[PDB]
Design a binder for this molecule. Structure first.
Ligand SMILES: [Zn+2]
Ligand SMILES: [Zn+2]
Ligand SMILES: [Zn+2]
Ligand SMILES: [Zn+2]
Ligand SMILES: [Zn+2]
Ligand SMILES: [Zn+2]
Ligand SMILES: [Zn+2]
Ligand SMILES: [Zn+2]
Ligand SMILES: [Zn+2]
Ligand SMILES: [Zn+2]
Ligand SMILES: [Zn+2]
Ligand SMILES: [Zn+2]
Ligand SMILES: [Zn+2]
Ligand SMILES: [Zn+2]
Ligand SMILES: [Zn+2]
Ligand SMILES: [Zn+2]
Ligand SMILES: [Zn+2]
Ligand SMILES: [Zn+2]
Lengths: 329, 32
């Protein structure tokens, strides 16, 4: 299982990196997979099989184990369903979303108040992300055909186990490519961290733990003449896991220079999910969402992801949210 | 001379739950 979700996270990251050349990237694989899994709970046939395989769940056994396993600093996740108030959704579907994701269904009038409904969902996401993710659902992503919106939000804030002293932060050049450099505020500290030199891809891997060391930031930095795209192509979840093992990533006194930075990204996920093989769920006539509703011209009309991260001398704050719009076709 | 980690060019990064070995967030820092 851990390998399933790691494989998904790395594939997601590789696709996003490849689809957004020379652009910052940031996502929450956990948020996206939570939203996609709630759809899976309402899907059948090939619609369901494509989504399970996108999540690296290739057998019925693997699907059941993934969901059953759910049943067992700040870090918080929230899931919610938003359903057209004049529709009914199957009890078994609502029960499964409640049991596995603690998702309740809030009724909205998509048919008569699409814009107020969009604002309500976006306000819910903002609350659950401490204001960091505003306007998850863009204009026209909710309309008279919208019937169900499945939403995940995640929020993290943690202090470093070994924070940087802001005294030693200084502006330095950051090489965005061979011919261009831009200034960054570079944090500095010499301390003992787990650090790997990865000969296979000519890169270094640093671990910076958060307080309690329950969570860590891992930074994969190519050696100074190596293009990051070559590391992206070589990357797999199995390799990344090997490189974090004690034999590769060992405690080392190291001078760390890491930029302070803040990113905000947003994604239309349809092209991503297509690369992972999800096609039927989007297609009028082929989508089978009959485990959510006895209405049976439903399809997946939109899947959006928005994220936020801030890294500075004290720690890290990160948030993300994912929304799936199911509509009547 | 000693070990140096100087992240002054593009890198990948990951926020991981260590016990679970779970990638919670990940990304690429390409430009300020
Ligand atoms: Zn593509
Ligand atoms: Zn950006
Ligand atoms: Zn299995
Ligand atoms: Zn089953
Ligand atoms: Zn009602
Ligand atoms: Zn209806
Ligand atoms: Zn529970
Ligand atoms: Zn709940
Ligand atoms: Zn609050
Ligand atoms: Zn090297
Ligand atoms: Zn090694
Ligand atoms: Zn090794
Ligand atoms: Zn020493
Ligand atoms: Zn591909
Ligand atoms: Zn400060
Ligand atoms: Zn440098
Ligand atoms: Zn460099
Ligand atoms: Zn833990």
């Amino acid at each position: 299982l851990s390998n399933a979700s790691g494989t998904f996270a790395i594939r997601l990251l590789k696709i996003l990196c490849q689809d957004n050349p020379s652009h910052n990237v940031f996502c929450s694989p956990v948020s996206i997979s939570s939203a996609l899994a709630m759809v899976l709970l309402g899907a059948k046939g090939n619609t369901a099989t494509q989504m399970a395989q996108a999540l690296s769940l290739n057998t019925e056994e693997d699907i059941h184990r993934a969901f059953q396993s759910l049943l067992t600093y700040l870090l918080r996740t929230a899931n919610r369903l938003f359903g057209e108030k004049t529709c009914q959704f199957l009890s078994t579907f609502k029960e499964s979303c409640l049991q596995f994701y603690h998702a309740e269904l809030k009724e909205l009038s998509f048919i008569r108040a699409a814009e107020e409904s969009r604002k309500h969902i976006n306000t819910w996401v903002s609350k659950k992300t401490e204001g960091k993710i505003e306007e998850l659902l863009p204009g026209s992503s909710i309309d008279a055909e919208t019937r169900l919106v499945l939403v995940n939000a995640i929020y993290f804030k943690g202090k470093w186990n070994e924070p940087f002293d802001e005294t030693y932060t200084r502006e330095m050049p950051f090489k965005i490519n061979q011919e261009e450099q831009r200034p960054v505020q570079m944090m500095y500290q010499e301390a003992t961290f787990k650090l790997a030199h990865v000969g296979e891809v000519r890169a270094q891997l640093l671990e910076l733990p958060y307080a309690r060391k329950e969570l860590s930031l891992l930074v994969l930095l190519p050696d100074d003449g190596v293009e990051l795209s070559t590391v992206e192509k070589s990357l797999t979840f199995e390799k990344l896991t090997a490189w974090t093992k004690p034999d590769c990533m060992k405690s080392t006194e190291v001078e760390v220079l890491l930029p302070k930075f803040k990113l905000q990204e947003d994604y239309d996920m349809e092209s991503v999910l297509r690369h992972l093989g999800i096609v039927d769920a989007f297609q009028q006539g082929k989508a089978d969402l009959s485990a959510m509703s006895a209405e049976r011209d439903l399809c997946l009309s939109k899947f959006v992801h928005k994220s936020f991260v801030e890294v500075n001398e004290e720690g890290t704050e990160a948030a993300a949210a994912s929304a799936v719009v199911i509509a009547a076709a | 001379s000693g070990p140096r980690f100087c992240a002054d060019h593009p890198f990948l990064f990951f926020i991981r739950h260590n016990r679970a070995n779970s990638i919670l967030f990940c990304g690429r820092f390409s430009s300020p």
